[PDB]
Every structure is written in structure tokens, then in C-alpha cells.
Amino acid sequence: MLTEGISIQSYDGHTFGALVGSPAKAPAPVIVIAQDIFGVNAFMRETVSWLVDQGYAAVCPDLYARQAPGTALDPQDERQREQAYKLWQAFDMEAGVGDLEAAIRYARHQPYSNGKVGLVGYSLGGALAFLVAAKGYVDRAVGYYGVGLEKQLNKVPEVKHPALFHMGGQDHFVPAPSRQLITEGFGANPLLQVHWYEEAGHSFARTSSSGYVASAAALANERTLDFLAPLQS
Secondary structure, eight states: OOOTTOOEEOTTSOEEOEEEEOOSSSSEEEEEEEOOTTBSOHHHHHHHHHHHHTTOEEEEEOGGGGTSTTOBOOTTOHHHHHHHHHHHHTOOHHHHHHHHHHHHHHHHSSTTEEEEEEEEEETHHHHHHHHHHHHTOSSEEEEESOSSGGGOGGGGGGOOSOEEEEEETTOTTSOHHHHHHHHHHHTTOTTEEEEEETTOOTTTTOTTSTTOOHHHHHHHHHHHHHHHGGGOO
């Protein structure tokens, strides 16, 4: 689901929609939410709700609009999971960073904006959060269980603004040697923080997932909120 009428334009000209949640009290810092591989779906609506309840505004851009605008897939439906994997495999990561950069610019100047912008991404969006952090587009970035971060470690020195990552100790997208690579690599730049949740795997913060772990979700979420709080007026 997207907010009707909302359109954002990327540097290359491509336009896309977004789900927007204005803040309870304005002005407020705006958080761009980078989707998981299921599009802008119920979990995105829940994340927008969560952030608005904590004093933020939120913008979740339709990152699958270069392939299939308006995709919103139910992760409990097997055929829709297959569609999500096919869309993820075809997803252009650099174009996704570009679309997030455009949503970040859009977030800086809405009527409800206080001019500060944070980014929170999950899974696919957690990998995008690290790439956006390396570009320096936002004041603060957060990634939950991004995949493939051990292949992007050369960008660690490029991060010049804070970025926080929550990783599952049982997420097998990140086996032990990849965890060690990330830990050591991210360890070189104090603007990066990575926490490991030993009893959790992928998708541990989505209540709807078979991998939900409430204690890890709660700890990571309060760390996310404490990390974004300086963006507030």
C-alpha cells in the first residue's frame, strides 16, 4: 500500500510512490524506511506506525517500482515469497541507493520536516542502509539484518555519519566467518556500530515472521530509537 498522490523523482528521472506517515506534532525528523524483499507491505505500514508513535514522520519508498510498481507481498503466502525472491534477484542495488537518495532529499523538505533525516532498512533495506551510509546521504542510518555486508567492507572508511546494524547470531545469511569479517571490518570505524543478537536469525524484528524473537526485537528497536533520538528537535 502506498499513499496516493505521493511521487518522488530519482536523479535518472524515474518516479516512484511511497507510503508516508506525517508526524503527530510537526516539525519532526523524517525517517526513510528501506523495505525488505516483500515491497511496501503490512510490515512497512507497521514500521511507519511504530515510528510515528515515537515522534517521527516516515517515508517508505516503492523501491520495486523500476520492476513492478506497487508490489506488496504477503510473506506467509508461498507463491508471493517466490515472487519476492525473483524481484530481489533482479533488483538493481545501485538504482535502489539512488531512489533512497531521492526519498531522503524529499524527506528533508516536506511541510512536517525538521530538516533532519534518518534511514532504517530491513534485510534488502539493511544492505541498502549500509550503502547509503557509505555515500553519506543521511544524518543516521540503521540496518536490520542486511545481507552480504561482508562483501562491502571496502566501503567502511567511506562512512562519515553514524550507522547502526542489528544482526542475528543465527541468521544463516551470515555464517561465522562472514560475521567475523564484518565485526573486524566495521570495528575500524567508530561511526559504525554492529550488535549481534545471539538467539535470533533473519527477520527477528517482524512479529509476523517465524523468526520473530521478541527480546531481540525489543532490544534492537530501543537501540534504534535511542540512536535516532538526536535527530529530534
